[PDB]
């Protein structure tokens, strides 16, 4: 079907279809454009007119240009050939390596799995990282919030999660970058190429990148999360595996939604956010679940405006999170890596009914001893180390050993640590911390636990450095 552009206010374009109207959310292509321009319908103003949000610059459009109704929403190429390929919101590759050749196309506007396509039992995603797997296990098919986001290891941690999940469970991964700085986007592309999660030669990649740039109109940065979700939903459903979906950043998702809502001419709500904030977030976050075929585990990088946790954006996103990780500058200083704050990290499934009584007790003991050491550090700073008892110097030693053991060497950071990366299973982690808490290793030096895999590596390090 063919219509005409009747109006062009900013990034909003009003089109007129004399024949038949396209339903809401469809994509229309403007004919007579040097570069593909896609308009997503959003309203039916009556008199056969529709109002569309543009996915690219509308400058140079003329009242009357022909617009072709595609007939289905934005359809992107999904498959195994998207792995290692960057592509913008409308699916066109932007890494200049040729077309994304696939036999499949998926519409980015889908619906959450019905109530019966839902796993009824909780699970645990084993990422092979001690701190994450012990103090804040990642639920399978559950959103994880990730805080910090500045020179603390967010990218290295993301790459390590990608590698472990593609090595342990064999699932692939999607990286949807919402409102992504082009400089940092290119830097991330190259870091992935170096670490090996993308392979431009042999086609053994493990990540599909989807960049919604920071200079695209608000109507494009609002939908790239949906493009990433579609790329991941293919792997969930069709490939029947567990996928990871990194959304960086989620505050930019909400902010772009807010800008689109304002542009369409809607009254803002609480703090000048869209009146549809809760549903705009829910429609996306409800497609990151554990269907009976596979699952999608999402990792949202989260930014808290004004450092206010009650701002509508994080107040609404935190309603969906099923866990939390808190990279801290104060721990990268100590040389511990990954710099995950052991105490500020949180998880919903840290429950004896889900993770098991032994796992729960080990985690609670580690948290308690770390809190005890934190409290004792004030006494050390003030009254001096002498003031401690003997049932407190012991706890200080045990807590320092635990802090050292929570650090790990990543396979994607062998050019930063000189060691060889370890993917510690879960049983190894639980046993190591159980033994350290019991006191079985009180005779070893603290540095024998720094940056080692399982506990047996700590034993070997002690032997190698003492002898």
């Amino acid at each position: 079907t063919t219509g005409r552009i009747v109006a062009v206010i900013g990034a909003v374009v009003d089109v007129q279809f004399d024949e038949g109207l396209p339903p809401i959310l469809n994509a229309l292509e403007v004919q007579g454009r040097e570069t593909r321009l896609v308009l997503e319908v959003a309203q039916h103003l009556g008199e056969s007119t529709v109002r569309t949000i543009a996915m690219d610059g509308t400058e140079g459009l003329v009242r009357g240009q022909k617009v072709l109704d595609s007939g289905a929403p934005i359809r992107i190429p999904v498959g195994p050939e998207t792995l290692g390929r960057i592509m913008n919101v409308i699916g066109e590759p932007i890494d200049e390596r040729g077309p994304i050749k696939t036999k499949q196309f998926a519409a980015i506007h889908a619906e959450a799995p019905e109530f019966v396509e839902m796993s009824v039992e909780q699970e645990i995603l084993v990422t092979g990282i001690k701190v994450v797997d012990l103090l804040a296990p990642y639920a399978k098919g559950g959103k994880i919030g990730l805080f910090g986001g500045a020179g603390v290891g967010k990218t290295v941690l993301i790459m390590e999660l990608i590698n472990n999940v593609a090595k342990a469970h064999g699932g692939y991964s999607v990286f949807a970058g919402v409102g992504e700085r082009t400089r940092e986007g290119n830097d991330l592309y190259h870091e992935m190429i170096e670490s090996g999660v993308i392979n431009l030669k042999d086609a053994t990649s493990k990540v599909a990148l989807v960049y919604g740039q920071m200079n695209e109109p608000p109507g494009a940065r609002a939908r790239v999360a949906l493009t990433g979700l579609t790329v991941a939903e293919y792997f969930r459903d069709q490939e029947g595996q567990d996928v990871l979906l990194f959304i960086d950043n989620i505050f930019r998702f909400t902010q772009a939604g807010s800008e689109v809502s304002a542009l369409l001419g809607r009254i803002p709500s609480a703090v000048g956010y869209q009146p549809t904030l809760a549903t705009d977030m829910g429609t996306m976050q409800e497609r990151i679940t554990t269907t009976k075929k596979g699952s999608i585990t999402s990792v949202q990088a989260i930014y808290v405006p004004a450092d206010d946790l009650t701002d509508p954006a994080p107040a609404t996103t935190f309603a969906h999170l099923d866990a939390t990780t808190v990279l801290s500058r104060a721990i990268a200083e100590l040389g511990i890596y990954p710099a995950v704050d052991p105490l500020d990290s949180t998880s919903r499934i840290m429950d004896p009914n889900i993770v098991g009584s032994e796992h729960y007790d080990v985690a609670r003991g580690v948290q308690k001893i770390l809190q005890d050491y934190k409290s004792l550090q004030d006494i050390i700073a003030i009254l001096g180390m002498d003031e401690l008892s003997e049932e407190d110097k012991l706890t200080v030693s045990r807590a320092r050993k635990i802090q050292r053991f929570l650090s790990q060497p990543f396979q994607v950071a062998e050019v930063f640590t000189g060691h060889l990366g370890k993917l510690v299973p879960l049983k190894e982690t639980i046993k190591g911390f159980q033994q350290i808490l019991a006191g079985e290793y009180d005779h070893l030096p603290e540095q024998a636990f720094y940056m080692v895999g399982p506990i047996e590596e700590a034993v070997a390090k002690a032997d190698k450095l003492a002898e």
Binding site: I267, P268, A270, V271, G272, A306, D308, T310, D311, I382
Partner: protein
């Protein structure tokens, strides 16, 4: 007397800092509420003026 006085001053300052921290937490919560309320109020004024033309 000087030993006990210095110890008591240390304890008193610790308690005063703790009370100031609790008060700072409460006032930060109030400040966030008030900041959001002010944003919403100004925005509603703008919206009402725009729609009342």
């Amino acid at each position: 007397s000087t030993t006990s006085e210095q110890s008591a001053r240390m304890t008193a300052m610790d308690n005063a800092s703790k009370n100031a921290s609790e008060m700072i937490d409460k006032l930060t919560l109030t400040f966030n509420r008030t900041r959001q309320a002010v944003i919403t109020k100004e925005l509603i004024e703008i919206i009402s003026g725009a729609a009342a033309l």
